[PDB]
């Protein structure tokens, strides 16, 4: 039939480094999670065919995360600026990506989008070439990403790897 | 899988 893949990341700044979190789904099932709040910060596969993997696989995955975190830390601060927000408080940037493939295996829709403090911030349109900007701050971001070629960067992923992986994954089941 | 995100905001 049809299928889907989603991955969510959230970073929450602290009054006192941001609490980073992630979780992945295919077909409304969790297949991995991460939380920098349990005593060991390590990825927890939730599905049999993932658990059986080399620990140098999970190593590289983890290395990537440390980067992504540092990215969140920097940009979280980029937002408080955009919104004239007090330095002392607590804010949450969240990000989701993924794809829906149809019955045919052909991508049916791709996603890439951020929400900030609960509210929609920016999101890649179904065309995979344009962005939708919730407000005045978001358009700034959009401009940067328009000129930087962000949409193209992620089309490559969404139309190719995002679909290829979902397939192998579903097959490994 | 991974599609890290690095573009500035």
């Amino acid at each position, epitope marked *: 039939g049809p299928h889907s893949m989603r991955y969510y990341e959230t970073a929450t700044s602290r009054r006192g480094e941001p609490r980073y979190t992630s979780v992945g789904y295919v077909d409304d099932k969790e297949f991995v999670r991460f939380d920098s709040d349990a005593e060991n910060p390590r990825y927890e596969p939730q599905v049999p065919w993932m658990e059986q993997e080399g620990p140098e696989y999970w190593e590289r995955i983890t290395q990537v995360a440390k980067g992504q975190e540092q990215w969140f830390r920097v940009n979280l601060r980029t937002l408080l600026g955009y919104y004239n927000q007090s330095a002392g408080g607590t804010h949450t940037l969240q990000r989701m990506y993924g794809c829906d493939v149809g019955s045919d295996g052909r991508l049916l829709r791709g996603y890439e989008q951020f929400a900030y403090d609960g509210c929609d911030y920016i999101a890649l349109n179904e065309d995979l070439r344009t962005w939708t900007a919730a407000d005045m701050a978001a358009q700034i971001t959009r401009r940067k990403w328009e000129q930087a070629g962000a949409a193209e960067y992620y*089309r*490559a992923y969404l139309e190719g790897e995002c679909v290829e992986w979902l397939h192998r994954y579903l097959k490994n089941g | 899988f*991974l599609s890290p995100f690095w573009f500035d905001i």
Partner: T-cell receptor
Amino acid sequence: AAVTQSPRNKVTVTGGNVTLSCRQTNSHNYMYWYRQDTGHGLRLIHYSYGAGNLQIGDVPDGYKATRTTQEDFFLLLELASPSQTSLYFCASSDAPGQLYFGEGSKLTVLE
Amino acid sequence: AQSVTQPDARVTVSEGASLQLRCKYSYSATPYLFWYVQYPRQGLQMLLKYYSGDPVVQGVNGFEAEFSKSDSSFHLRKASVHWSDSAVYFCAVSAKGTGSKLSFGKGAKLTVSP
């Protein structure tokens, strides 16, 4: 385009202190310090995601970096060694793989 | 693991001739690719990027590159090289996860004979 290194030229003797500065007027979050030597191409010394972050690069030994503010990134050779005679490039970025370079700082450390 | 390889460090051609600089990339999906140029006594300049889409990328200065999935190829091309195009040309991929960092080729020093 405006990523500017200071000083363009510098000579010092083994044991000396050297400080290469780099200013970027884009509002880029990433900044990088590279060296370039014939036979080794471009090698990354240290970089930074954004203000107050440092990341080690491929050849950090002997160098420290400081990202005080959003637009200033400094390379610091606190005890300079002949090995370090070379040409250094600063670069800013706001997207994967897209770096905007400064013009070079040529440094000789004399034994 | 994600490298890119340039075959020749030194290369010479004649004013007017047509240029092809070879760049092969270690396999990755999905590849993000770049050509940078370094004019004498200067820094690197981004020539062009390939993120997705048209596998024939138009850079500035009448340069262009062709993304070949088939080959693992990202060849840089110009039709009629003038002399001012003498410079060093760098190929580069932006690994994923290794994405904050750009990973360079060795470089190709191009000499356009007048």
